[PDB]
Amino acid sequence: MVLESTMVCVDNSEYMRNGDFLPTRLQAQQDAVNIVCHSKTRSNPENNVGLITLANDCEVLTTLTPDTGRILSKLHTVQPKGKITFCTGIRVAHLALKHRQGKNHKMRIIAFVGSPVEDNEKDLVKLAKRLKKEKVNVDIINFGEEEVNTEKLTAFVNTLNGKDGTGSHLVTVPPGPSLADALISSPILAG
Amino acid sequence: AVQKVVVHPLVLLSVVDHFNRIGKVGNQKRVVGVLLGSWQKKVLDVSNSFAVPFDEDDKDDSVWFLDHDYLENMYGMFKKVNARERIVGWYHTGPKLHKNDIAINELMKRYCPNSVLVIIDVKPKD
Amino acid sequence: MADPRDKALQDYRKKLLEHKEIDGRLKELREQLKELTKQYEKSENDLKALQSVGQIVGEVLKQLTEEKFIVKATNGPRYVVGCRRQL
Amino acid sequence: EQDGIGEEVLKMSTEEIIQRTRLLDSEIKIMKSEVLRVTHELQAMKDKIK
Amino acid sequence: VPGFLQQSQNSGPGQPAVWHRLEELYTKKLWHQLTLQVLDFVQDPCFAQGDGLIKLYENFISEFEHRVNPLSLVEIILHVVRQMTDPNVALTFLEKTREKVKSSDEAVILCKTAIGALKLNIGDLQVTKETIEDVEEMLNNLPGVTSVHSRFYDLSSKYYQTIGNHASYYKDALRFLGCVDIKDLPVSEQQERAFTLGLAGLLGEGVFNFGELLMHPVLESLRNTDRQWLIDTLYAFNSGNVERFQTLKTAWGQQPDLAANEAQLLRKIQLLCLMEMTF
């Protein structure tokens, strides 16, 4: 019933082409896209969801549309062959959120991290204080093989919303047999 | 290998107005739009065009937006009112081209393979 | 009762009966999407086929100049005409 | 293929728990994401060419 | 299957820290840090005598593969088929590895060069031209690999040891010089490239020197110490003087493949002095 615009941010790098998440990590992260799009549609039939990729390019393959079946057609041939790029992936995610055709919706980004990040901590904390001035809740969800709980991601969660902020949760995964049940326990309803 | 392009004199004109539409708030100093055309021979022809919502930031100079969704449906309308017309490329203004133009061109070559961009000069006319 | 060679073997049957059940409707539904594209091809050919404003059939009587000719309709009057560009 | 059936006879979990694993991974995907994408192609085309 | 590498643990130096690390990474069922490290440990400088002790497991990797980059799969099987050192079955082995990755992945193009690299060794005329010609038919629609330009222009570099290849090799040894750019391989290979590049452009018919590749640093920055006479004589063609001293001092030094065409060298300078004195 609440009005927002959720922007999912998948990874199609090479590092999702391994099988600790048992069938395929693409098959893991696509089901994660399956449950967040059906969550944001059934909790509110008025919002809209678009996807953005981050590896090797930043493609806006679906624009921020209310129908989810376009997204699910574009999750096929996602071609996991890229190399992770992070610093432009959120600035290209936010300028999409300044293209809101309905300017009463809130601004929300979710992102899937299945590759190690290689970026300065000073760049992201400038982006963190940018999003503080820009009032965006980004929910970082960790997948894949992981430099587990970096200080850069953890402080970016803290410097997203400090001094009694929202609490945009840093979702951590145990690498092993799991569904999106840890993804839906706390953060998909209380973020 | 394209021989040459032919400027129908409605398209330029229809870049001047849309630069004047946003020109009350114009500080981006660039307007990207889609160049409709008629592929005849090795020589090329241009008949019509339209615009697209476009943003760009010099900070990190790779953060920008064509709208694929707006490019699908509005071109689909111009296809419906005129089956002769199709896409041949795109355009922008602000006579110094910018570093992003590799990214726009290599994106929308998946609409027409031998796509072509045309820079007009709205303010220089001398 | 953990694994006495049959709770093993009864599983492999009910897992593989379920996979071939769900792979079957996938092939049937993909075949139906292949069929409608053939129908959509004929519709877009018809949308292309909607601008044959005709052509007038005549015969050349004589040549006036390099780009002026004298033609006549099959039941109508005579005219002075030209060519397109590169005829 | 005698070893193909026969290794499912003397192994109790390797030839079964993985088959439990690779089905429940498939059935939550190859059922779900595949036929729902195909569902969101047919409803569009009937809202098309009609 | 883990004990397959427990018995072939040896001869890879620092055995416990790397081979027990190896049997960690595929028991995590990951396929990139696994893949990048086995490519590193074949690149590990030894004799690589355990190619047979790894080509069974790399075939085992290839059997339940279903995710791994076929580029790096062929990039590691070329080291395997190198260390086989038996060209009888190595042709049919590489055809088998080429036909089992038969998708649209563009490592098949450098399978064909690896076919030809062992085919410009034996049977050097009848179908070597075809396995050359098929590659630039396929060198299309994605010029951004540049390893497609690497392996094929190396295949035509081995085609230089035919009779009628002087200018086309010189045209193509520049193409390899322009596709791959940075130093990234020793001067002890680079100055030998520029030495045979200057000889191919000198014995070529239509070319005389075609300067400002003289300005290109892969010949002058690498042999400004030894064989300066080749840089000196290519300046003398660009100078347009006859200058009988240094244009014979190249023939005093370079005795093979230069005294057999010294009259053509005198033929070239007499037609080259005109087009600079009229300039």
Curated annotation (Swiss-Prot), chain A:
Single GO molecular function: molecular adaptor activity
GO cellular component terms listed in the entry, alphabetical order: cytosol; nucleoplasm; nucleus; proteasome accessory complex; proteasome complex; proteasome regulatory particle, base subcomplex
The VWFA domain, residue ranges: 5-188
GO BP: proteasome-mediated ubiquitin-dependent protein catabolic process
Origin superkingdom: Eukaryota
Entry keyword annotation includes Phosphoprotein: yes
Cross-link named Glycyl lysine isopeptide (Lys-Gly) (interchain with G-Cter in SUMO2), sites: 122
Disulfide pattern: none
Alphabetical keyword list: Isopeptide bond, Phosphoprotein, Proteasome, Repeat, Ubl conjugation
Family to which the UniProt record says this protein belongs: Belongs to the proteasome subunit S5A family.
Entry domain remark: The 2 UIM motifs are involved in the binding to a multi-ubiquitin chain in a cooperative way.
Subunit structure: Component of the 19S proteasome regulatory particle complex. The 26S proteasome consists of a 20S core particle (CP) and two 19S regulatory subunits (RP). The regulatory particle is made of a lid composed of 9 subunits, a base containing 6 ATPases and few additional components including PSMD4. Interacts with NUB1. Interacts with SQSTM1. Interacts with UBQLN4. Interacts with UBE3A. Interacts with UBQLN1 (via ubiquitin-like domain). Interacts with DDI2.
Protein name per Swiss-Prot or TrEMBL: 26S proteasome non-ATPase regulatory subunit 4
Organism: Homo sapiens (Human)
Gene expressing this chain: PSMD4
From Swiss-Prot, chain B:
Residue ranges of domain MPN in the record: 5-126
Signal sequence, start to end: none
GO biological processes: proteasome-mediated ubiquitin-dependent protein catabolic process
Record-level Gene Ontology MF annotations: protein homodimerization activity
Entry GO CC: cytosol; extracellular exosome; extracellular region; ficolin-1-rich granule lumen; membrane; nucleoplasm; nucleus; proteasome complex
Keyword list, A-Z: Acetylation, Isopeptide bond, Proteasome, Ubl conjugation
Family under the similarity heading: Belongs to the peptidase M67A family.
Further comment found in the protein's record: Does not bind a metal ion.
Assembly description: Component of the 19S proteasome regulatory particle complex. The 26S proteasome consists of a 20S core particle (CP) and two 19S regulatory subunits (RP). The regulatory particle is made of a lid composed of 9 subunits including PSMD7, a base containing 6 ATPases and few additional components. Within the complex, PSMD7 interacts with subunit PSMD4 through their respective MPN domain. Interacts with TRIM5.
Function description: Component of the 26S proteasome, a multiprotein complex involved in the ATP-dependent degradation of ubiquitinated proteins. This complex plays a key role in the maintenance of protein homeostasis by removing misfolded or damaged proteins, which could impair cellular functions, and by removing proteins whose functions are no longer required. Therefore, the proteasome participates in numerous cellular processes, including cell cycle progression, apoptosis, or DNA damage repair.
Curated annotation (Swiss-Prot), chain D:
PTM characteristics: Sumoylated by UBE2I in response to MEKK1-mediated stimuli.
Cellular compartments annotated: Cytoplasm; Nucleus
Superkingdom of source: Eukaryota
Record family assignment: Belongs to the AAA ATPase family.
Role noted for this protein: Component of the 26S proteasome, a multiprotein complex involved in the ATP-dependent degradation of ubiquitinated proteins. This complex plays a key role in the maintenance of protein homeostasis by removing misfolded or damaged proteins, which could impair cellular functions, and by removing proteins whose functions are no longer required. Therefore, the proteasome participates in numerous cellular processes, including cell cycle progression, apoptosis, or DNA damage repair.
Assembly, per entry: Component of the 19S proteasome regulatory particle complex. The 26S proteasome consists of a 20S core particle (CP) and two 19S regulatory subunits (RP). The regulatory particle is made of a lid composed of 9 subunits, a base containing 6 ATPases including PSMC3 and few additional components. Interacts with PAAF1.
Protein name as annotated: 26S proteasome regulatory subunit 6A
Organism the protein comes from: Homo sapiens (Human)
Lineage: Eukaryota, Metazoa, Chordata, Craniata, Vertebrata
Protein's gene: PSMC3
Complete-protein stretch covered: 25 to 74 of 439
Curated annotation (Swiss-Prot), chain E:
GO BP term, pick one: proteasome-mediated ubiquitin-dependent protein catabolic process
Domain PCI: 168-279
Alphabetized UniProt keyword annotations: Acetylation, Proteasome
Molecular function in Gene Ontology: structural molecule activity
GO CC annotation, single: proteasome complex
Protein function: Component of the 26S proteasome, a multiprotein complex involved in the ATP-dependent degradation of ubiquitinated proteins. This complex plays a key role in the maintenance of protein homeostasis by removing misfolded or damaged proteins, which could impair cellular functions, and by removing proteins whose functions are no longer required. Therefore, the proteasome participates in numerous cellular processes, including cell cycle progression, apoptosis, or DNA damage repair.
Subunit structure: Component of the 19S proteasome regulatory particle complex. The 26S proteasome consists of a 20S core particle (CP) and two 19S regulatory subunits (RP). The regulatory particle is made of a lid composed of 9 subunits including PSMD13, a base containing 6 ATPases and few additional components.
Family: Belongs to the proteasome subunit S11 family.
Protein name: 26S proteasome non-ATPase regulatory subunit 13
